[PDB]
């Protein structure tokens, strides 16, 4: 292996999954599960047949209370979901043998469409999956019901919305976890464009599986943006391993030992463990007796700090069962950690900086919203390179019903469509499987 680091992979239940694994076995560049996950994220499309049928019936086209009187079309689409799904399969596939997968959702009120990787392979970006699925659903419906030529463009509009008058699929009845790249904040931010509530819905509100999924997507994105290149690579791997995948059960144990604790007690526990493991050491003593600490291993210290961060989130938000405190928690975990030790905070201040804006924009008039609608492609929460958003995912798992913009309201259909995909729902156990599959090949 390139790096010397070895780790133990522990499950969300605190039990050992895989022992003595080289760090790169969980790298997005090596782990086959992460590869499959990213592939599925890009090629998978949700089609809302009931939405299409309803839109057509009212001529509710283009969304946001748009109605076009006199252009109504009445079609029994959901009733014929199986026939339509089969035609969509024929139009979307490249061969009878490829990895095209169509699955009825909510008894055919919705459809999961997974476009074959072959189509993705000869496309520039990922929009192809929606674009091709869109064309397939449009032709499947027109062919199935012999829609009149002058009514047919209403079907197109019902499926894909206002496009191309709008730059995206505004008011469409299909969606993809990734939005169109034309709406990206930053170059290479595709995988950062998934709201925290979607992550929670997809993982069925299981805390560590949500933070894992968010961390896998964020850290994989850091490879896409070129941030996890060269000098910085190991930092992002260790971040993924410890904060995302509960390496050496550190995350699970910080939470366990602070079940009745505070952000402060989580920090104490973390700093103690860091001193114990030689991750951090005293550089000098000050006149008060205050000890100033320094990292013995900078990337590893950051990973430890990041793990304490997610633990503190789970402890403080879990105690409240109210997610609004996640921004506050992320901010003061880092603030208190730095003045407790003299060490740099998580992501060298960027997790904290993010939490400052995150706090502001989830408690003010100027923008943002509830914590569940934030993601890595958000102007407010883009700034930490993978270390903040997993806390947001965890926090929304723990919310017992304090939010207006809750998981069910924002992400219900999304959960039903994608949570079937096992790698999405239970990433930790399946990533460990992938690690075992490749550890000896490194």
């Amino acid at each position: 292996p390139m790096y010397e680091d070895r780790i133990d992979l522990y499950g969300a239940d605190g039990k050992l999954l895989e022992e003595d694994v080289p760090l790169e076995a969980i790298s997005p560049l090596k782990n086959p599960t992460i590869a499959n996950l990213v592939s599925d994220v890009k090629r998978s499309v949700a089609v809302n047949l009931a939405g299409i049928e309803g839109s057509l019936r009212k001529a509710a086209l283009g969304g946001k209370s748009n109605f076009i009187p006199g252009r109504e079309v009445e079609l029994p689409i959901v009733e014929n979901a199986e026939a339509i799904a089969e035609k969509v399969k024929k139009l979307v596939q490249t061969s009878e043998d490829d990895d095209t997968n169509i699955r009825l959702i909510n008894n055919g009120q919705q459809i999961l469409v997974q476009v074959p990787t072959t189509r993705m392979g000869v496309a520039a970006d990922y929009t192809v999956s929606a674009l091709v699925t869109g064309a397939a659903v449009v032709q499947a419906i027109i062919d199935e019901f012999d829609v009149d030529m002058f009514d047919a463009n209403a079907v197109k509009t019902a499926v894909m919305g206002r496009y191309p008058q709008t730059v995206d699929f505004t008011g469409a009845n299909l969606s993809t976890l990734l939005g169109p790249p034309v709406l990206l904040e930053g170059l290479g931010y595709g995988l950062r464009n998934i709201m925290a509530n979607h992550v929670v819905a997809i993982t069925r509100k299981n805390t560590l599986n949500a933070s894992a999924l968010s961390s896998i997507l964020e850290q994989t994105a850091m490879f896409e943006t070129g941030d996890a290149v060269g000098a910085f690579e190991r930092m992002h791997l260790l971040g993924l391993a410890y904060q995302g995948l509960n390496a050496n059960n550190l995350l699970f144990d910080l939470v366990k030992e602070n079940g009745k604790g505070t952000v402060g007690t989580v920090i104490a526990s973390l700093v103690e463990r860091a001193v114990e493991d030689g991750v951090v050491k005293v550089a000098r003593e000050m006149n008060s007796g205050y000890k100033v600490y320094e990292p013995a291993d900078w990337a590893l210290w950051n990973a430890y700090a990041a793990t304490g961060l997610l633990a503190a989130t789970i402890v403080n938000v879990g105690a409240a069962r109210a997610a609004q405190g996640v921004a506050s928690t992320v901010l003061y975990y880092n603030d208190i950690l730095e003045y407790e030790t003299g060490l740099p905070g998580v992501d060298f201040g960027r997790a904290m900086g993010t939490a400052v804006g995150f706090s502001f924009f989830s408690h003010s008039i100027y923008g943002g919203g509830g914590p569940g609608i934030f993601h890595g492609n958000h102007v407010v929460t883009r700034h930490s390179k993978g270390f903040a958003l997993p806390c947001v995912a965890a926090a929304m798992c723990l919310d017992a019903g304090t939010q207006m913009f809750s998981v069910e309201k924002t992400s219900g259909l999304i959960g039903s469509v994608y949570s079937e995909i096992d790698y999405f729902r239970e990433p930790i156990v399946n990533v460990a499987k992938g690690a075992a599959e490749v550890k000896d090949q490194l």
Partner: protein, 548 residues
Amino acid sequence: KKLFLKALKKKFEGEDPDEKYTNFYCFGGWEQSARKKEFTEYAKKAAEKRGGIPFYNPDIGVPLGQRKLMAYRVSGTDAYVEGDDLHFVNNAAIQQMVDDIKRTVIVGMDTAHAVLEKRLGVEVTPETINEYMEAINHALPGGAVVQEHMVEVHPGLVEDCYAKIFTGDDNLADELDKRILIDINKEFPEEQAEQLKSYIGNRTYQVNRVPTIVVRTCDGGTVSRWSAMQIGMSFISAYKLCAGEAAIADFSYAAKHADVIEMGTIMPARRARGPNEPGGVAFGTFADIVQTSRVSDDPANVSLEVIAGAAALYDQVWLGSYMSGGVGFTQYATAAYTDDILDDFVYYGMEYVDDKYGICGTKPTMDVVRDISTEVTLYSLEQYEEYPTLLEDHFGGSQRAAVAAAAAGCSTAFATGNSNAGINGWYLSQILHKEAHSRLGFYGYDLQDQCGASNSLSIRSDEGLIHELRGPNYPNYAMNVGHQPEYAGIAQAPHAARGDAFCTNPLIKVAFADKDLAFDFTSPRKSIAAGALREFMPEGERDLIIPA
């Protein structure tokens, strides 16, 4: 008798209107024009301010007025003006129309009220709403409500800034303050009011009109944000909330994203603009902004008034400035709203359709489209052939193409109730027009024209779209004059024929049913005419804060 004959007779006074011959080079050039003379005098007086920097000079390049320079009649009005008076820079009415559209945003109140009740334990009544509506008419124009030592906006600069409310819930409407209510039952005829309320349901919306001086200083993207900020402040004030707590973020998200209705959507990078700019305004959205539908049951008149407004917005301001600029595109646009020429063609087509099919008398078919489009196109071409002064009036082919095809397209829509049938008729008109005169428009006029038939009824990616939702960013339409204003008419046409209360959005339709708007959207023609005569008072001037 032809509707344009009156205007032609006054425009070519003392000339035989059947005569193919006339006299040129005998008018004294630019000195024939009172307006050009005014311009030259102002140019001279300006030398001192400009410190001698050369300026407007009629002796530069082309010697204008070798022919006789026309006056134009704004159709349906008594305003006869030189064309310069219809340029958007010279016409304060055209400028205010754009600003009024740009500075308007609609925001749902039901989500915010739900936030108040479920998260903040506040009960919402008509009394608290009336209090909120009074607070925001202080906050929106820039008055302080929460903080000490706030400086504030001069009210004299922003008298056009206000907020109103409407609801599909008649019982609630009876309890709201009349001063800030847009009354759907009052402003619309009964059948339209019922149709609107059936689509709106028991939902409630505020209509925020940001100050004109603000969108002029800034842009359209400012508006939904400005609105949202002061919505937030007003809720904090009227309901005595913590001035900055978690639930406040829900108001913001609703007001900026989830419950906001904008006039226009953003542009792609190559022609980048924020929301509420003219390019993002869909044709059916503009048709609903125009208010002629609710004061007239004449489908031709309703469509003609939409085209008049759309001509100023899309060709003069959007394509003629935003996307190009300079002398611009005044007469590409005025061809569609002066001298009652387009009126004649449209009323001919409507009569033809009414006699043969009945208004909304047939399902759309290619047979019906071909029949109507060909007949109306032929009739329109024959008018230009029969009246030499008419041809001299619409001297540019693009103008003649747009006008004939508009009549053809609207008529098709009048018959079928289908806007996409309408534009398919439009494209037939164009290529027929081309074969007849062995010419059409300018160099790149018929890009969308030749692309048009195939894409009119397409169902593919960036081709298929119901016409009402097409707009200036629809790829075929993104570049060229002499289409977009007329497309707005065709989007309006089938709904006017059906007697629909709206074309694409009931909330937009209701939002502009308001006499306190500066521009009169019930008749764009009459307002533009008032601007041409310099009788229209715009908003956002700065006389109060500058030297005399």
